[PDB]
């Protein structure tokens, strides 16, 4: 009917716009280390490019945004909420607010700046569905946004069951059969075009291609690490409440400071600006991104992060975990390299979704709570290594799969959902840790549920949206 | 709270019942099996046994039944349904409904019949959470027994995420995201207790620890075998509405044909043996049972359909397949066998559950879509002996891979929901097919909603429900 049409419309599109996002965003990412190597000897030179190449994206981002739709700037997920809510803000959904999206997440995205897709792109996707409704039937709205937020978070990274779960929690609170099958038919689709997409180009993009995990996990699962699950869970749901709030504290600060305020509103581009400098300036290699690893990209950081190996192990011989070589640095331990990284990329993914530009939370999130899993897998192999002994099995331990499971908790903890548990599940594409992670995203979003609000609900409560 | 005691009765109890019942049933079925080769050289000895001991327990089951609660006969989710659309019966929700149904499914499960677990267990579930309910407070409603759908449906097989989706879908059309997260968690607890439970007696027994894929698949996936895989998802919802509609038709049949109705109320226990009888003389092993595997029993059944072999490849040497060597057969090659499998477990289910007992539809129909999917996948292996090149890598042809998409799409067309394939992809400990499935199911749901209601739905129609 209309309305099947109106899906394979949505998914399409959606996975289009995804995927050409992804592209420019790679190339650009691309570009950013080859100038950044072109400058091997100088380095002065090697921080010009590190910091300038963002500086000059998150600048355009918050640029174009301000020229063409200032409504473009930060997540959509809080303002959909509202539109999903009755109140619906009209300048949301319009096509100047597409086009100011779209181009300025591509830059903010091939930055390297820890912004997130997730988030953005549901206001994109609808945008697109409005769009494409009216293309349709003028050429109800909560239905249409619904199966919108659907499409946005499955073409994003492309897990279709997990991101029409993602909408189901993190919009509405009683969601209908139909909206549940709608979105799953259209997120399918999405699903579909990526997938030829990534036969045309061969694929190369993306993050489905990545973040495959290679994990060999034995059936019964050692139960003696569930305690350790547990406490990723815990410990993701309390961190996650952190962030929620030190997030909330800077957004607010940055306008009800009157000093910050009107500062930052007589020179806009200051505060990305600056913000921008000094998350590079932190992240530039030779400086302080040697014990951070911030050579590596937030994709790239999840591809290590997820990966098979031990780096507390192999790491008197680096160079045989491939990229995830960064992670041990010649002095420092590799563990307290993961802890840097956790905390030098929560202020920086705190900061950076304050930044005037179309920003999500989940992927910062996500690298975080890699790398919180990653920390404790990693001191979990310093404490077995020789694995644990449950039944009559010995289970080594996994680090890279208690990654995938602080990954889900600490999102789930953010966003306030367990549907990050699907999320992960098929964007590693295993399904062995489904009982500890389940576990653990359920004490996350306990604990954080218990402490502050979701980042949605609390960007709301700053943004004063109706709601 | 007091409503996060409740989930954790729920899951507690839910698991240790579920546990329970499979012990036993896999214990009666140790025991069928044992007694059968204890009559070895005597054909009418094997006989006498093959028919009896099914016999035995299932005129128990519908005695036991018609003794205790009458009301505890048939699948719980339709009559949930209508419990759940305001109009309750409160002859199902009590202990003597209870009792009756466990014991009896216990029994219908250790025949061997194709009866099913899933959809008694709600039902089970749901008693149960009222029965915590009451325990807990007394000494609303729909929220309630949604949650104990959710239990029952995730503690049956192992299938937490599952379980919440089908439950979601299967009664209500408008859940509530509360009720979907109240519902996680009380099948993450059920999930978490299976596991201990699993630990202590070492397993062998349930189904999580069964139908377990070891399948090696590329990481692109061959986009060449999504035709076939379309093609199952057609072709199972085309059956799924012939189940459904078979099934109506003899539910009616033997209730609307007045001499039929009369006689099997004077004597109730003809209609189960004489049912019972028949199934079980053409699973004969030695009879026809050679040329539809009746050796198998519904569980061993999925266990060697949804191998990682070839079986029309290595059907010269049997024996490498292990479990799955019932399916070569000396003279009648795999491919009919397995055809054979599918057209009299076809009707057998059908009769089956149309019998007097507990009885669900899931399983039967599950193996059922594992037959047709494996069916269809070791005729792509004909076809494709060498594999399929699509990109510049040979995909060889997985037949079991294609069974597990052929039985969450049947299932998915009888059930009328799209979270069989997230049961399969928890039951199957593997989600790399998550591409094929989901299209499948989404296609098998299409063709099946346009063709016939779903097995619960029609079965509202039949038994007059009041909905």
């Given at each position: 009917?209309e309305?099947?049409?109106?899906l ?17 965003s790679?190339?650009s990412?691309?570009?950013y280390?080859?100038s950044?190597?072109?400058m091997?000897?100088?380095l ?6 590190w910091?300038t190449f ?8 918050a640029?174009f945004?301000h020229?063409?739709?200032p ?10 909420k509202?539109i ?8 949301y959904?319009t096509?100047?607010?597409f ?5 300025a997440?591509?830059a ?5 700046i ?11 996707a609808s945008?697109?569905a409005?769009?494409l409704?009216?293309?349709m039937?003028?050429f ?6 619904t199966?919108?937020?659907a ?14 779960l993602?909408s189901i929690?993190?919009t509405?609170t009683?969601?209908?059969?139909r909206n549940?099958w ?6 399918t689709?999405?699903?579909?075009v990526?997938?030829?997409l990534?036969v045309?180009?061969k ?7 990545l973040?495959?995990t ?9 139960l003696?690490e ?9 410990c993701?749901?309390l961190?996650?409440?952190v962030?929620?709030y030190?997030?909330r ?9 009157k ?5 930052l509103?007589?020179h ?22 040697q ?7 937030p994709?790239?950081a999840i ?5 098979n ?6 790491a ?15 002095r420092?331990?590799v563990?307290?390299i ?6 030098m990329?929560?202020w920086?993914s705190?900061?950076?979704t ?24 990693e001191?979990?192999?310093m404490?077995?290594?020789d ?10 331990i996994?680090?890279?799969g208690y990654a995938?499971?602080?990954a889900?908790a600490?999102t789930?903890?953010?966003s306030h959902?367990?549907?990050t548990a699907?999320i992960?599940f ?6 062995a840790h489904?009982?500890?992670?389940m576990v ?8 954080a549920?218990?402490l502050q609000?979701?980042?949605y ?5 700053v943004?004063?949206?109706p709601?």
């Amino acid at each position: 009917g209309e309305d099947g049409i109106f899906l394979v419309l949505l998914g399409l599109l959606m996975a289009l716009v995804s995927w050409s996002m992804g592209y420019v965003s790679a190339k650009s990412l691309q570009a950013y280390k080859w100038s950044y190597a072109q400058m091997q000897p100088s380095l002065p030179l090697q921080f010009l490019v590190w910091v300038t190449f963002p500086l000059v994206l998150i600048l355009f981002s918050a640029l174009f945004c301000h020229l063409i739709s200032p409504q473009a700037v930060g997540s959509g997920i809080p303002e959909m909420k509202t539109i999903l809510r009755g109140v619906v803000l009209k300048e949301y959904l319009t096509m100047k607010a597409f086009v100011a999206k779209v181009v300025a997440l591509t830059a903010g995205l091939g930055s390297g700046i820890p912004v997130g897709k997730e988030g953005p792109f549901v206001h994109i996707a609808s945008i697109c569905a409005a769009v494409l409704s009216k293309f349709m039937s003028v050429f109800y709205y909560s239905d249409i946004l619904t199966v919108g937020c659907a499409v946005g978070v499955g073409c994003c990274f492309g897990t279709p069951l997990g991101g029409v779960l993602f909408s189901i929690e993190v919009t509405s609170t009683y969601f209908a059969v139909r909206n549940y099958w709608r979105g799953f038919f259209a997120a399918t689709f999405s699903a579909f075009v990526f997938r030829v997409l990534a036969v045309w180009n061969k694929d190369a993009v993306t993050i489905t291609a990545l973040f495959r995990t290679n994990f060999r996990m034995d059936f019964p699962f050692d139960l003696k690490e569930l305690p350790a699950f547990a406490a990723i869970g815990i410990c993701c749901g309390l961190l996650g409440a952190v962030f929620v709030y030190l997030h909330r504290q800077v957004m607010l600060g940055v306008r009800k400071h009157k000093a910050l305020s009107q500062f930052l509103a007589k020179h806009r581009l200051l505060y990305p600006g600056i913000v921008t400098f000094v998350i590079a300036s932190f992240t530039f290699p030779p400086g302080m991104g040697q014990f951070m690893a911030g050579e590596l990209m937030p994709r790239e950081a999840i591809s290590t992060l997820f990966d098979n190996n031990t780096w507390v192990k192999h790491a008197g011989d680096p160079e045989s975990l491939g990229q995830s070589a960064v992670w041990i640095h010649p002095r420092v331990n590799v563990v307290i390299i993961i802890f840097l990284f956790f905390v030098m990329k929560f202020w920086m993914s705190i900061v950076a979704t304050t930044m005037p530009i179309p920003c999500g939370g989940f992927m910062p999130v996500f690298v975080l709570g890699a790398a919180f899993g990653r920390l404790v897998g990693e001191i979990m192999a310093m404490l077995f290594p020789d694995g644990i002994l449950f039944d009559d099995i010995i289970y080594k331990i996994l680090p890279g799969g208690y990654a995938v499971i602080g990954a889900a908790a600490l999102t789930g903890a953010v966003s306030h959902t367990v549907s990050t548990a699907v999320i992960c599940f098929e964007l590693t594409g295993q399904i062995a840790h489904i009982l500890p992670m389940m576990v653990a995203v359920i004490l996350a979003n306990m604990v954080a549920q218990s402490l502050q609000p979701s980042l949605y609900d609390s960007i709301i409560q700053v943004k004063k949206l109706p709601y």
